[PDB]
Amino acid sequence: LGLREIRIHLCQRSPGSQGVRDFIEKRYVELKKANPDLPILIRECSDVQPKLWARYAFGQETNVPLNNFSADQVTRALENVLS
Amino acid sequence: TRPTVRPRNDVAHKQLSAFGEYVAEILPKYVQQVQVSCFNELEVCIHPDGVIPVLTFLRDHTNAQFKSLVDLTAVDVPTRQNRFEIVYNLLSLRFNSRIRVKTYTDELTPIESAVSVFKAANWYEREIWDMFGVFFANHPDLRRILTDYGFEGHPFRKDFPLSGYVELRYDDEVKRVVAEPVELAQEFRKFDLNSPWEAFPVYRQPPE
Amino acid sequence: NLIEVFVDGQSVMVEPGTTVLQACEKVGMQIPRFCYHERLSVAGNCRMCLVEIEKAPKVVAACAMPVMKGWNILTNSEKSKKAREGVMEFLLANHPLDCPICDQGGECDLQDQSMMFGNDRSRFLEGKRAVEDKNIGPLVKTIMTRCIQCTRCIRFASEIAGVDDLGTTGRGNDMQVGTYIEKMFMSELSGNIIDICPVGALTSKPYAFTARPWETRKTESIDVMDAVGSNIVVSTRTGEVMRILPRMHEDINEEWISDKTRFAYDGLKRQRLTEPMVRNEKGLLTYTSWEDALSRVAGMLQSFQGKDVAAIAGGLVDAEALVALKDLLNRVDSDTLCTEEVFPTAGAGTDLRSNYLLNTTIAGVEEADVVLLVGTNPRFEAPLFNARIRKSWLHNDLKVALIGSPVDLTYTYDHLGDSPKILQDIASGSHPFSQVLKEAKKPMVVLGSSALQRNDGAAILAAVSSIAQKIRMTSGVTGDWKVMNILHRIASQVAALDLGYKPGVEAIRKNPPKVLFLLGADGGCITRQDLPKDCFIIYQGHHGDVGAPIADVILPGAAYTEKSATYVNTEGRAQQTKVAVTPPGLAREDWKIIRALSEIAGMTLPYDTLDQVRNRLEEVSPNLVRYDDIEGANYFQQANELSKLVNQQLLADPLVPPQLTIKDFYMTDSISRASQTMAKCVKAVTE
Amino acid sequence: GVRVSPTGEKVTHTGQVYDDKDYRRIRFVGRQKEVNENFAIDLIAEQPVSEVETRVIACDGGGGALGHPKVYINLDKETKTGTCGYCGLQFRQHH
Amino acid sequence: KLDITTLTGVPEEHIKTRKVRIFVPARNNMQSGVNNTKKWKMEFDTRERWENPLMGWASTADPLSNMVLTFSTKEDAVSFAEKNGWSYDIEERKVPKPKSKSYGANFSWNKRTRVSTK
Amino acid sequence: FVKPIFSRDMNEAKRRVRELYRAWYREVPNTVHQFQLDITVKMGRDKVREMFMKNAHVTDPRVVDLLVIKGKIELEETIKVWKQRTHVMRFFHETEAPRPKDFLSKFYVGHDP
Ligand code: SF4
Ligand code: SF4
Ligand code: FES
């Protein structure tokens, strides 16, 4: 119930995406190391806001936009959605 | 250059031209282009807000009594926002002259009605109302010519199908003729006969 | 910079060098032509290009003479017209009187330009020559008589096709370009010559006599017969598909689509899932209304939510049906998401999306100063791309060499042995060939996607990742080059991986009853031994080949041109299909049946229109909503490589492409399989 | 002697007769389906093959401007007859 | 949004059911002529057309299906579909990229162009 | 911006429509008897209310007033005992089959969009 698939969206160039870009370039290897099971799909899409889908039980999905968030705040959301 | 070719009448082109600048003088406020082709066929612009005041002047002598509105020929080009291109063909009988003086309008512009001025346009009116939707200044009645009664469409808008959406037939238990959805058999099997490779370099709009 | 030369009146900043042709064609003026071709090569034969320069004593060849300053070019000038008249009087001096029976005769370029130029009356008084017919293939009939010594076809053939059987023969009168000897021309791009023929000399046999160009509508889209994702203009007529033509695009086909795709359409005309076919008490299927079969599968799929269900994705299948079906599996939390070809995922490569992408565009290949390939030959997966290779080989000049096999590519390539040694000797950089890899900048590293499987192909994966990283270590790379890339042959896995459903590993084929079939074209990866008990297995392909009979309670569905469902190119390019002739009978839009089953399942999908499922794609993909956007942030090999090295797999023998040779290339998907032209053609290449 | 369908009605010269399942066959009931007695196909090969010792020839279909456009049939290969693209009738160069 | 959805006589069904297609028409592959790539045009999406039970004719569904419309520019066509209330899909122009060419480029022993006999 | 047909802002227009409704709403029985419509007259008034509902999304006063221009023009043909009974019945489309907006039925019918 805690998760099945999780995924994020990211502007290729926008300032509100940049800290997140730096994050995926760093710690993503660690978080991905943490979870052999549940995928953390990531997309390059220049959708107006960086995004965070997270499926739970029976396909329901949380969706927090990542506009104007630092990578530390991003991670701050990330531990919150472990379940 | 002759047995097949139609000879070019320079003389009438000269006279029509000179008269064209003459008119260009006379009504600077609405008159624009003074087109003069080798067909001996002169043409002139009018702004739609300038429909009536020009036309009335035309009927009255200057050196051309533009008597008899022979036609209010109409064309619709969807590209231009001023899609409509109302044209006043005219003929000054005393001077045996012919001229084509056109305009433009949008869908909700109440272009001036020459009904008071010519009255010949009591129907050039209602056709070009009905086929299109070119609303007109002040006419005794805007009831439709040609197209039926309950009919909703505006064919000659160069829009919606040549068959139209409507195809009526008598029906049994209703004991009466009823309009129905088209269902054409065989369908107008349109041929695209357009030719790549321009035959007329002399024309040709630049790629720009 | 650019030299100045005058079009008739206007001054023009024309490029240094370059022909008068491109000069007039900059202002938009267009010179009459035949033998010349825009992406071929200049040839002086058939001088329709004649024009006089403003100071020219006599007319020049506009398609060939390089521009230079101080010239002026009155294309409309009388002498040039006398010249064109000189050409057309002669071409028609001996041409056959057979416009009407010509398949090209309804649209031949010779005709249009016969209208544009040349005297209306002719003055022949003797006896024209006429050559005998000269067969060069089952699928490319050649009437000849008609060919105008224009040599565009040999310059195509000898070059990009790589085959040289075609060519000139003889001199003086009764000279002919008829190829020597009886032997058929053959090529994997044999069909494209048909397009390139100005006249009716090279009329295709399968399409012969069938139709006339003006009648046809030209509905457009893209083919999925290749993973190349080539664009297409389709000449349908009267609800029937009359012929396929490529739609040009420099990033992809550059107006030279696969000969296999070109005759694919015929296969749509063979057997089709026309009506629903539910097995009876006898276990035999019978024709059935949708309410029956769909209420039945509605009776099955409410039973086994979550576990004990799976879904066999096809290779040609549209992404949308996958979207709705996985959403169905979401509502029941059925995690299973299996897909035809498996793709290895050390550190889970589905996430980075870039992993499976051919990160360099086919357009981007030309700038590479060095290119390498691994495993399957490009031509039996991307013949277009093979032509791109040979074109670069004829132009850009760079090394290429095969690994794992010496398959008969048209261009020169260094021979190399097999993976276990080569991959490590190159990963080490010890291999002299790898020393050449350090030697040259703008690297490219290709892998046959067939080798991604290879049981222990994960070894080749980590190996090649180490290789590309090592060549990055060699530096001289811009670093944004995205050296790491592969050639997918599948039309569907790339989008499913954009959605990252699963690696597609078939090891899952364990317990689940009531697996659903999407296409299910192969008898290989899946079969009914997965569940000894029930053989109940739902199906929604369109041709009945292989997968359909195994399945029960069959559910017929649309072919690709009919649906407007989208497809993703291997370069990550997104491009939707558009509607054409619509499904033949009870066949319908593919995912619509899914939304219907879900609607009966008590878990109806929130979106209604296909435009609204596309609206859903933005809230998940989110890249399917955007079409021409190949570009993105690109995750870079840093984070990528790190989990690749936290695994490692043993390398092995052997390493062979699936397709081997030409004769095996004619039967892949259900349309290519069922197409009759394919059967005749494979029997041709046999005996 | 048109080939007879299982229903018994004669097939069209372009063979296409309706299936026994086919309800549409009902239209012919009470009436007569019509198909031409004289198939052109048999009449194509019925004719003797004309032969001329020369080489290239010029068929006109019989009748100046009463037939197909003038056409130059080649006879490069004696292994085969030179069927017209129009008349459909064969030619050969006997020697 | 100057909708003329009611000002036009069109049935609401045909304006609801479908989006139209704005685009610039492609050059013939089979023919040299670039000439029709110029001038934009918009066309409605094709629908199913069942065969006539008699005589095997086409039996068209949607009446409007054969419509076609030229435009000077793309924003022009977008403006029409906006004025008229139908949904649409913009498509880009496709002028071929310029290619450097020269008569001698075919030759030269070193360039491996060479070609052959001529 | 551009010069208006007649009414400027909605109320100059809204005034015209009500003038229209009554112009129909009183006229209806006259029509019921001239053509001897078999419809109960309240059905006629209901249809009168309905055609005034289809035009609910109108927002430009030029669109409103142009619609009442055309609608009064239709009233012309109605009152003058032009048209025929059939033309009056064209508004009903009773010969036509009902349309199931439900998507599932739309699946069941045909290829459709
Ligand atoms: S090739 Fe062009 S010209 Fe020659 S016959 Fe066929 S159509 Fe007529
Ligand atoms: S095919 Fe016949 S006509 Fe077309 S180019 Fe080659 S030779 Fe000239
Ligand atoms: S155009 Fe190629 S030579 Fe005349």
> What is the DSSP pairing of strand D57-59 with strand D71-73?
antiparallel
d(CA D16, CA D11): 7
C505 and C517 inside one domain: yes
Cβ–Cβ below 8 Å for B201 and C116: no
Hey, what amino acid is at C315?
G
User: Given the DSSP bridges, would you call strands C538-539 and C516-517 parallel, antiparallel or unpaired?
Assistant: parallel
Q: Which of residues 29-88 of F touch E (CB under 8 A)?
A: 54-55, 57-58, 60, 63, 66-67
Let me know whether C627 and C637 are in one domain.
Answer: no
Q: Which residue has 């017969």 as its token pair? A: C225
**Residue F42 identity (one-letter amino acid):** K
Question: Phi then psi for C60, rounded to 5 degrees?
Answer: -100, 165
Q: Is D2 helix (H, G, I), strand (E, B) or coil?
A: coil
Task: Count the Cβ atoms, other than its own, within 10 Å of residue B58.
Answer: 26
State if residue C24 touches ligand 3 by the CB under 6 angstroms criterion: no
Which tokens is C532 given?
């000894």
* Co-location of C40 and C187 in the same domain: yes
B192/C214 touch (CB, cutoff 8 Å), yes or no: yes
Q: For residues B124 and B131, is the Cβ–Cβ distance under 8 A?
A: no
Q: Which of C392, C658, C447 is nearest to C570 (CA)?
A: C447
Place of tokens 């130029």: C117
Method: cryo-EM
Containing structural domain, residue E113: 1-118
Containing D58, the helix (H) or strand (E) segment is strand D57-59
Residue C528: what residue type?
A: R
Query: Which residue minimizes the CA distance to atom 1 of ligand 3?
Result: C33
Domain assignment of residue D42, given as a range: 1-95
> B97 pairs with which residues across the strands?
B92
Closest CA to D73 of D92, D94, D48: D92
C97 → closest Cβ in D56, D69, D74: D69
CA–CA dist C594, C328 (Å, integer):
8
Please state the φ and ψ torsions of residue C220, each to the nearest 5 degrees.
-110, 155
Q: How many distinct structural domains can be found in chain E? A: 1
Q: What would the two tokens of residue C500 be?
A: 């990252």
CA-based nearest residue to C40, from C228, C198, C168, C187? C198
Contact by Cβ (8 Å): C553, C273 = no
Alpha carbon of C47 to ligand 3 centroid (Å): 5
Pocket of ligand 1 contains residue C198 by CB under 6 Å: no
What chains are in contact with F, requiring at least 3 Cβ pairs below 8 Å? B, C, E
**CB-closest option in C97, C101, C131 to D74:** C131
Q: What is the 3-state secondary structure (H, E, C) of B51-110?
A: HHHHHHHHHCCCCCCCCCCCECCCCECCCCCCCECCEEEEEECCCCEEEEEECCECCCCC
Closest CA to C501 of C328, C336, C315, C332: C336
Cα D80–D84–D90 angle (5° rounding)?
Answer: 45
Give the C-alpha separation, C590 to C609, whole Å.
Answer: 13
- CATH number listed for the domain at residues A1-83: 3.40.30.10
Q: For C622, which of A9, A26, A28 is closest by C-beta distance?
A: A9
As a whole number of angstroms, the distance between CA C625 and CA A73 comes to 29
Please report which residue ranges of chain D form alpha helices under DSSP H: 40-46
Q: What's the full length of chain B, in residues?
A: 208
Tell me if A3 sits within 8 A of A39, measured CB to CB: no
Task: Say how far apart CA C675 and CA D69 lie, in whole Å.
Answer: 37
Largest CA distance in chain C: 91
Residue at a domain's end among C631, C652, C675: C631
C-alpha distance from residue E115 to each of C40, C97, C385, C413 (Å): 11, 34, 21, 19
Chain C residue numbers touching D86 (CB-CB < 8 A):
101
Cβ-based neighbour number of residue F60 at 10 Å: 19
Residue C167 and residue C275 in one domain: no
Question: What angle do the packed helices C457-474 and C432-439 form, to 10 degrees?
Answer: 50
Distance CA C326, CA C197 (A): 47
CA distance D84 to D81: 9
CA distance C452 to C344: 7
Residue B167, helix vs strand vs coil? strand
Q: Which residue has the tokens 């509605």?
A: C298
Tokens of C300: 């099955």
3-state class of C227 per DSSP? coil
With a CB cutoff of 8 Å and minimum separation 6, the contacts of B197 are C30, C112, C113, C116, E32, E33, E35
Cβ neighbors of C30 (< 8 A, separation 6 or more) are B197, B198, C24, E34, E35
SS3 assignment, position E95? coil
What DSSP string describes C91-114? HTTS--S-STT-SSTTT-HHHHHH
The Cα-based distances of C320 to C592, C624, E94 in angstroms read: 10, 10, 28
C612 and C468 co-located in one domain? no
How many domains are contained in chain D? 1
Separation between Cα atoms, residue C570 and residue C361, nearest integer Å: 9
Instruction: Report chain E residues whose CB lies below 8 A from the CB of B78.
Output: 69, 71, 80
Instruction: Give the integer Cα–Cα distance in Å for C293 and C287.
Output: 10
Answer yes or no: are the C-beta atoms of F106 and F100 closer than 8 Å: yes
CB atoms within 10 A of CB C258: 25
**Closest by alpha carbon to C576, among C329, C332, C223?**
C223
For residue A15 the two structure tokens come to 């300032």
Pairing mode of beta strands D91-92, D50-51: parallel
Let me know: does C273 contact C541? Beta carbons within 8 Å.
yes
- Ordered alpha helix ranges (H), chain A: 15-25, 28-34, 71-80
Q: Which of F5, F82, F89 has the CB atom closest to B110's CB atom?
A: F5
- CB of C42 within 8 A of CB of C82? no
Contact C326, C620 (CB under 8 A): no
Which residues of C contribute to the annotated binding site for [2Fe-2S] cluster?
A: 35, 46, 49, 63
Q: What Å resolution does this PDB entry report? A: 3.4
Structure tokens at E87: 């949904």
Q: Which three-class secondary structure state does DSSP give residue D27?
A: helix
Listed in sequence order, the residues at least 6 apart from B41 whose beta carbon sits closer than 8 Å to its beta carbon are: B98, B100
- Chain F touches chain C, with at least 3 Cβ pairs below 8 Å, answer yes
Based on the fold, state whether residues C464 and C379 are members of the same structural domain. Answer: yes
Q: Is C88 helix (H, G, I), strand (E, B) or coil?
A: helix
Distance (Å) from CA C584 to ligand 2 centroid: 38
Same domain, yes or no, for C15 and C105? yes
Cis status of the peptide bond prior to C654, with omega within 30 of 0 = yes
Cβ–Cβ contacts within 10 Å for residue E29, how many? 19
Domain boundaries defined on chain F:
1-113
Beta carbons of B180 and F95 less than 8 Å apart: yes
> CB contact, 8 Å: A25 with chain C?
yes
Q: How far is CA C204 from CA B177, C27, C242, in A?
A: 52, 36, 12
Pocket of ligand 2 (CB under 6 A): C 147-148, 150, 152-153, 177, 197-199, 201-202
Q: Which two tokens stand for residue F93?
A: 């489309």
Query: B101: which 2 tokens?
Result: 């003086």
| Measured distance CA(C63)–CA(C447) in Å, rounded | 40
Q: Do F95 and B143 touch (CB under 8 A)?
A: no
Q: At C241, which helix (H) or strand (E)? A: strand C240-246
d(CA C349, CA C30): 51
Contact D37, D2 (CB under 8 A): yes
Q: Are residues C120 and C196 located together in one domain of the fold? A: yes
With DSSP H G I counted as helix, E B as strand and the rest as coil, what are the percentages for chain E, rounded to 5? Answer: 20, 20, 60
- Distance of alpha carbon A19 from alpha carbon A66, whole angstroms: 10
> How many whole angstroms separate alpha carbon C407 and alpha carbon C413?
10
Tokens 């040009």 sit on residue: C248
Count of beta carbons in the 10 Å neighbourhood of residue C55:
8
Q: Answer yes or no: do C237 and C299 share one domain.
A: no
The CA E55 to ligand 2 mean position distance, Å, reads 40
Helix axes A15-25, A71-80, angle to 10 degrees: 70
Q: Name the pairing type of β-strands B42-45 and C240-246.
A: unpaired
Domain count, chain C: 4
Q: What are phi and psi of B29, to 5 degrees?
A: -65, -25
Encoding tokens for residue F50?
A: 């309905």
Give me the phi and psi of C197, to 5 degrees please. Answer: -80, 120
C interface with F, Cβ–Cβ < 8 A, is: 290-291, 582-583, 588, 592-593, 595-596, 599, 608-609
Structure tokens at C534: 């029930």
Q: Do C644 and C626 share a domain, yes or no?
A: no
Helix or strand or coil: residue C11? strand
Report residue D48 CA to chain centroid gap.
14
Q: Looking at chain C, how many residues does it have?
A: 687
Write the burial class of residue B29 (CB in 10 Å: 0-12 exposed, 13-18 middle, 19+ buried): exposed
Nearest C-alpha in C relative to B196: C112
How are strands ordered across the β-sheet holding C231-237?
C217-222, C231-237, C240-246
Which structural domain range is residue C229 located in?
A: 212-269+666-687
Closest residue on chain B to F63 (Cα): B108
- How far apart, in Å, do the first and last CA atoms of chain B sit? 34
**Between B and C, how many CB-CB pairs are < 8 A?**
25
Residues C110 and C186 both lie in one domain: yes
Handedness of CA C56, C58, C60, C66 (dihedral sign): negative
Residue of A9, A2, A66 whose CA lies nearest to C498: A9
CA of F62 vs chain B CAs: smallest distance (Å): 7
Q: Are C410 and C164 in contact (CB under 8 A)?
A: no
